[PDB]
C-alpha cells in the first residue's frame, strides 16, 4: 500500500519524510496513476521525487521530457549516485551509446527504468519505432513533461517543440502524464492542460504563494508631506522588532534609476537609517563591498535598482520598500519575497505614483514596439502590459493585498489574518484611495 512508498523513499532516495505534505499528496496521486497530475512547486521543492519515486514503484519505463541537456544531466547524475537504472537519450551521446540504449528499449525486460529525453528527440522519427514498440508492449508506466510551462506563449520560455508533446500523450492513452513547472499564471496552467492533452480530472499540486509573516501596504507619493521621512520611519518601525537587541534585522529599498538609488541611500543615512546604494553602474568590488556590509549587518539597509538587486538572499530582511512600482506583479512578488525568509514578522510597502505608472507604461509600450520590428507580432506582446497592469490594479484596488496576489498567480483565498493594510483597517485605505482621486 502506502507501505511501499515509505520504503522506496528511504531505501532508495535516503529520505525519512517528504519536504511538505503537498509533495507527499502529489507523489501519492502520481503513484495511483488513475489520473494525470500537474505539480507547480517552486525551485528546490522536491518536484523530481513526485515522478522519480512513482516511476520505480511502477513495473515499467518512465519517460521524462526535459527541455535542455544541462537540466537532464544534473538529475540523471544524482539518480545514478542512488544506483537507479536512469538513461538520457540526447545528441551529446556517441552514435554507439545511442544505439546501445535504443537496443535496450527494444528488448523485453529493458534495463532502463527512467528515460530522460529532450523534446527534440521525442519528436524525431529516429526514435519513433522505438517509442511505438515501448507503447505496444505496454512498457510505458508514465510520461513526465518537466518545464511544462514551455508549451505556453503566455509563459516566457515557450519552445515550439513542446507542441508535439500533446499528440504524444493521446497515443499512449494507457499511461499517466505528470506535468511539472516552478511557476504558472492561471493562463499557463490552462495552456499546459490543453496543449499536453492532460486527461480531466487533472490532479493539481500548486504551492501557495501566500506567506503569513509578510505585511503588505501601499502609500501614494502624491499624498506624502515628507517622502524621505515617511521612508526613514517605515524602515525604523520595521527594524528594532527586538527592542532588547535594539535595532535588529536588515532591509531593502527599490528604485527605477541609479541616481535615485545613490540619492535615497544618502537621504536615508542623513535622516539616521544607515543605507548603501547597489546598482549595475558601480564596479564589481563596490557591489561586493556594499553587499558584504549588508550580509554581515555592518549596514542595516541597501537600495537596489529594479533592473538589478539580490546578489545573494538573506533571512532577517525585516522590510522591502519599493520607491517606484515594478515592471510586473511577478517582479514585485519576487522582490518583496526576499523579505522575511526567517519567518519572523516583516513589512513590504509599495510607494505608488501615477507619474511612475505612466513613466513605466510608456517604456513598456516603446520596447514592445522595438520588438515588433525586430522579430514581429505575438501573443506574449499583450502579456507584458498585462503583467504590469495587475500591479497597478494591486495599488488602485481596496481589497486584501495577499488575496490580490493569490488571484494573479492562481492560489485560493489566503487566510490574511489582519495581515495587510486593507485587512487591518479597510477604511483608512478607502480614505487614502479617495484622496489620490482628487490629486489624480
Amino acid at each position: 500500500p502506502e507501505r511501499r512508498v515509505r520504503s522506496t523513499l528511504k531505501k532508495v532516495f535516503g529520505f525519512d519524510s517528504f519536504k511538505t505534505p503537498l509533495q507527499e499528496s502529489a507523489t501519492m496521486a502520481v503513484v495511483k496513476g488513475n489520473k494525470d497530475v500537474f505539480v507547480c512547486m517552486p525551485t528546490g521543492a522536491g518536484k523530481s521525487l513526485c515522478y522519480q519515486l512513482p516511476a520505480l514503484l511502477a513495473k515499467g519505463i518512465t519517460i521524462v521530457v526535459s527541455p535542455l541537456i544541462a537540466l537532464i544531466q544534473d538529475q540523471v547524475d544524482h539518480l545514478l549516485t542512488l544506483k537507479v537504472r536512469v538513461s538520457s537519450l540526447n545528441s551529446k551521446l556517441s552514435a554507439q551509446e545511442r544505439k546501445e540504449l535504443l537496443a535496450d528499449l527494444e528488448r523485453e525486460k529493458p534495463q532502463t527504468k527512467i528515460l530522460y529525453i529532450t523534446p527534440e528527440m521525442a519528436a524525431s522519427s529516429s526514435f519513433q519505432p522505438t517509442l511505438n514498440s515501448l507503447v505496444s508492449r505496454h512498457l510505458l508506466s508514465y510520461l513526465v513533461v518537466d518545464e511544462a510551462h514551455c508549451v505556453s506563449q503566455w509563459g516566457h520560455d515557450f519552445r515550439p517543440d513542446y507542441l508535439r508533446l500533446g499528440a504524444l500523450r493521446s497515443r499512449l492513452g494507457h499511461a499517466p502524464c505528470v506535468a511539472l513547472t516552478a511557476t504558472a499564471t492561471p493562463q499557463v496552467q490552462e495552456d499546459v492542460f490543453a496543449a499536453l492533452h492532460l486527461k480531466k480530472p487533472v490532479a493539481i499540486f500548486k504551492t501557495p504563494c501566500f506567506r503569513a509573516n509578510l505585511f503588505y501596504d501601499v502609500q501614494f507619493k502624491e499624498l506624502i508631506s515628507d517622502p524621505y521621512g515617511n521612508l526613514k520611519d517605515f524602515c525604523l518601525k520595521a527594524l528594532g522588532q527586538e527592542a532588547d537587541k535594539g535595532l535588529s534585522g536588515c532591509g531593502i529599498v527599490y528604485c527605477r534609476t541609479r541616481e535615485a538609488c545613490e540619492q535615497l541611500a544618502i537621504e536615508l543615512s542623513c535622516r539616521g537609517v544607515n543605507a548603501k546604494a547597489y546598482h549595475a553602474g558601480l564596479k564589481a568590488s563596490e557591489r561586493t563591498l556594499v553587499q558584504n556590509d549588508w550580509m554581515e549587518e555592518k549596514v542595516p539597509v541597501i537600495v537596489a535598482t529594479i533592473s538589478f538587486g539580490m546578489g545573494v538572499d538573506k533571512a532577517n530582511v525585516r522590510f522591502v520598500a519599493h520607491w517606484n512600482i515594478a515592471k510586473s506583479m511577478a517582479g514585485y512578488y519576487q522582490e518583496s519575497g526576499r523579505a522575511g525568509r526567517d519567518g519572523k514578522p516583516s513589512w513590504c510597502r509599495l510607494y505608488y505614483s501615477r507619474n511612475d505608472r505612466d513613466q513605466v507604461s510608456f517604456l513598456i509600450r516603446k520596447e514592445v514596439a522595438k520588438l515588433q520590428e525586430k522579430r514581429g507580432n505575438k501573443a506574449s506582446d499583450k502579456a507584458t502590459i498585462m503583467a504590469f497592469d495587475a500591479l497597478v490594479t494591486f495599488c488602485e484596488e481596496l481589497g486584501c493585498r495577499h488575496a490580490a496576489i493569490a488571484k494573479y498567480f492562481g492560489d485560493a483565498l489566503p487566510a490574511c489574518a489582519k495581515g495587510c493594510d486593507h485587512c487591518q483597517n479597510p477604511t483608512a485605505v478607502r480614505r487614502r484611495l479617495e484622496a489620490l482621486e482628487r490629486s489624480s
Partner: nanobody, 124 residues
Framework: QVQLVENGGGCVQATGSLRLSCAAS????????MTWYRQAPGKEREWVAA???????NYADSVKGRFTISRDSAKGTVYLQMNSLKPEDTAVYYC???????????????????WGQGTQVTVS
C-alpha cells in the same frame, strides 16, 4: 468535488419570463466555459448560451435578443434571464462547467468538467 445546482424554473404563460441560476459550489477559482444546454422532451440537447471567464457571451440564434446570461462574479453563480418565452423553450435547462479549476488554500486542486442537476421549465 464540485456541485452544479440549477434553480429558478417553473411553469409560466407564453410572453412570460424566468431567470435560471447555476450555483457552482466547491473551491472554484475559474470556469473556462459555463454553457446553458436545454433538453426539450423528444429532441436532441440544444446549445442555448455560454460565458467564458471575462464574460464573452454567445447565444443560439433561437434565443438571441430574448435571453442573456451573466455571472454574479461575487456569488460565483451564472444566470440565464429568459424573456419573451415560447412553448418551444419548454425543456430542462442545465449548465456544463467546462474547465472548472478548483484549488484549496492547502495547494491541493483539480481541473474538470461538471454537469448541473437541471431545472424543469414548461411554457403554456
Amino acid at each position: 468535488q464540485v456541485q452544479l445546482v440549477e434553480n429558478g424554473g417553473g411553469c409560466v404563460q407564453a410572453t412570460g419570463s424566468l431567470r435560471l441560476s447555476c450555483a457552482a459550489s466547491g473551491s472554484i477559482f475559474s470556469i473556462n466555459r459555463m454553457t446553458w444546454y436545454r433538453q426539450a422532451p423528444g429532441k436532441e440537447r440544444e446549445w442555448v448560451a455560454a460565458i467564458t471567464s471575462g464574460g464573452s457571451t454567445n447565444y443560439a440564434d433561437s434565443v438571441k435578443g430574448r435571453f442573456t446570461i451573466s455571472r454574479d462574479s461575487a456569488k460565483g453563480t451564472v444566470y440565464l434571464q429568459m424573456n419573451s418565452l415560447k412553448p418551444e423553450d419548454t425543456a430542462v435547462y442545465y449548465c456544463e462547467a467546462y474547465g472548472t479549476y478548483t484549488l484549496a488554500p492547502t495547494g491541493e486542486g483539480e481541473y474538470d468538467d461538471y454537469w448541473g442537476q437541471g431545472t424543469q421549465v414548461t411554457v403554456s
